[PDB]
Design a protein around this motif. Structure first.
Motif, PDB file in Angstrom:
ATOM      1  N   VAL A 252     -25.832   1.496 -19.206  1.00  0.00           N
ATOM      2  CA  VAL A 252     -26.328   0.160 -19.548  1.00  0.00           C
ATOM      3  C   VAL A 252     -27.856   0.181 -19.407  1.00  0.00           C
ATOM      4  O   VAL A 252     -28.385   0.839 -18.509  1.00  0.00           O
ATOM      5  N   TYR A 253     -28.553  -0.501 -20.316  1.00  0.00           N
ATOM      6  CA  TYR A 253     -30.012  -0.626 -20.235  1.00  0.00           C
ATOM      7  C   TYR A 253     -30.391  -1.414 -18.983  1.00  0.00           C
ATOM      8  O   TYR A 253     -29.892  -2.519 -18.770  1.00  0.00           O
ATOM      9  N   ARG A 254     -31.262  -0.833 -18.159  1.00  0.00           N
ATOM     10  CA  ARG A 254     -31.647  -1.451 -16.883  1.00  0.00           C
ATOM     11  C   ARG A 254     -33.150  -1.639 -16.703  1.00  0.00           C
ATOM     12  O   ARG A 254     -33.581  -2.604 -16.069  1.00  0.00           O
ATOM     13  N   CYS A 255     -33.928  -0.705 -17.245  1.00  0.00           N
ATOM     14  CA  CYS A 255     -35.388  -0.814 -17.296  1.00  0.00           C
ATOM     15  C   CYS A 255     -35.940  -0.004 -18.467  1.00  0.00           C
ATOM     16  O   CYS A 255     -35.232   0.832 -19.046  1.00  0.00           O
ATOM     17  N   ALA A 256     -37.199  -0.272 -18.815  1.00  0.00           N
ATOM     18  CA  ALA A 256     -37.935   0.525 -19.794  1.00  0.00           C
ATOM     19  C   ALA A 256     -38.162   1.942 -19.254  1.00  0.00           C
ATOM     20  O   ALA A 256     -38.421   2.103 -18.053  1.00  0.00           O
ATOM     21  N   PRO A 257     -38.043   2.973 -20.124  1.00  0.00           N
ATOM     22  CA  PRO A 257     -38.313   4.334 -19.653  1.00  0.00           C
ATOM     23  C   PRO A 257     -39.803   4.522 -19.348  1.00  0.00           C
ATOM     24  O   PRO A 257     -40.641   4.079 -20.143  1.00  0.00           O
ATOM     25  N   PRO A 258     -40.134   5.148 -18.194  1.00  0.00           N
ATOM     26  CA  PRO A 258     -41.542   5.400 -17.866  1.00  0.00           C
ATOM     27  C   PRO A 258     -42.175   6.381 -18.862  1.00  0.00           C
ATOM     28  O   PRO A 258     -41.449   7.209 -19.427  1.00  0.00           O
ATOM     29  N   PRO A 259     -43.508   6.286 -19.089  1.00  0.00           N
ATOM     30  CA  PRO A 259     -44.201   7.215 -19.993  1.00  0.00           C
ATOM     31  C   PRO A 259     -43.857   8.676 -19.707  1.00  0.00           C
ATOM     32  O   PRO A 259     -43.659   9.042 -18.541  1.00  0.00           O
ATOM     33  N   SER A 260     -43.784   9.483 -20.769  1.00  0.00           N
ATOM     34  CA  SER A 260     -43.348  10.891 -20.710  1.00  0.00           C
ATOM     35  C   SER A 260     -43.909  11.662 -19.511  1.00  0.00           C
ATOM     36  O   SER A 260     -43.160  12.357 -18.817  1.00  0.00           O
ATOM     37  N   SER A 261     -45.218  11.511 -19.281  1.00  0.00           N
ATOM     38  CA  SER A 261     -45.937  12.045 -18.110  1.00  0.00           C
ATOM     39  C   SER A 261     -45.654  13.528 -17.828  1.00  0.00           C
ATOM     40  O   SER A 261     -45.383  13.924 -16.686  1.00  0.00           O
ATOM     41  N   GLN A 262     -45.707  14.331 -18.890  1.00  0.00           N
ATOM     42  CA  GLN A 262     -45.577  15.782 -18.789  1.00  0.00           C
ATOM     43  C   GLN A 262     -46.864  16.381 -18.232  1.00  0.00           C
ATOM     44  O   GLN A 262     -47.961  15.872 -18.493  1.00  0.00           O
ATOM     45  N   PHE A 263     -46.715  17.454 -17.458  1.00  0.00           N
ATOM     46  CA  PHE A 263     -47.841  18.164 -16.853  1.00  0.00           C
ATOM     47  C   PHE A 263     -48.639  18.917 -17.917  1.00  0.00           C
ATOM     48  O   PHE A 263     -48.074  19.560 -18.803  1.00  0.00           O
TER      49      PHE A 263
END
Length: 263
Positions: A252-263
């Protein structure tokens, strides 16, 4: 308008059930939202009404048919149609009450149950907990007949409640969890009915929390562990999304996905 997926208990096999659950998942999720390899259901917020529901047409060996309506935001069974009558669980809010008026619009008789469709309510009405309600192809065959005959007085309320409990777990929970799908596949393979063990029950109970924990995780790592149960009732601690990838099929949708934030 709304997509229809067909399943029959008549001569059901592992393969036909697998095809069915795969098709249900395909109509529930768009593919727009996959996090740690786990698909997320559409966000309720701003979801157009023409995309809100799917229909599951269940047939049985007794040559009877019922249509379940599922809400794509949570895979919840919101109601059903059998011939000339449709029945909906008591809506949680005004938006949901409006939403269900878009379902089975040509049906002669429309009813809303005064009771909600949650397990707590259904178990109290059934006079039995999920742990004591047998699941399998036989139970589903019988559940379809019980839903069919409700409007003509053939089905007592505890039987109806039990039948909803069967349908919800074998369709919605199986769609949500590959693990639960697997448990139903086993029952079908051997044509052996049995009540769900603690591993099934605790997964069902934890779906919301698991969805939130995964979506709020730090790179997959939970801030707080979630306790599940094994088949024998013993504790299984979940610290990370990784262990859940073979277990949970959709969230179930619960929050927006955080930015990709790849190293």
């Amino acid at each position: 308008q709304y997509p229809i997926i067909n399943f029959t208990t008549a001569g059901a096999t592992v393969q036909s059930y697998t095809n069915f659950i795969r098709a249900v998942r395909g109509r529930l999720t768009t593919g727009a939202d996959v996090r740690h390899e786990i698909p997320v259901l559409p966000n309720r917020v701003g979801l157009p009404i023409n995309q809100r529901f799917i229909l599951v047409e269940l047939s049985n060996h007794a040559e009877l048919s019922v249509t379940l309506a599922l809400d794509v935001t949570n895979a919840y069974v919101v109601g059903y149609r059998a011939g000339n009558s449709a029945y909906f669980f008591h809506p949680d809010n005004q938006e949901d009450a409006e939403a269900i008026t878009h379902l089975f619009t040509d049906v002669q008789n429309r009813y809303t149950f005064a009771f909600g469709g949650n397990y707590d309510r259904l178990e109290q009405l059934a006079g039995n907990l999920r742990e004591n309600i047998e699941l399998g192809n036989g139970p589903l065959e019988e559940a379809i007949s019980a839903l069919y005959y409700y409007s003509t007085g053939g089905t007592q309320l505890p039987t109806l409640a039990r039948s909803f409990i069967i349908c919800i777990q074998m369709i919605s929970e199986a769609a949500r969890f590959q693990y639960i799908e697997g448990e139903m596949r086993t029952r079908i393979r051997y044509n052996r009915r049995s009540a769900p063990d603690p591993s099934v029950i605790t997964l069902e109970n934890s779906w919301g929390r698991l969805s939130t924990a995964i979506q709020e995780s730090n790179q997959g790592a939970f801030a707080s562990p979630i306790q599940l149960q094994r088949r024998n009732g013993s504790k299984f601690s979940v610290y990370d999304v990784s262990i859940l990838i073979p277990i949970i099929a959709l969230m179930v949708y619960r929050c927006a996905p955080p930015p990709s934030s790849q190293f």
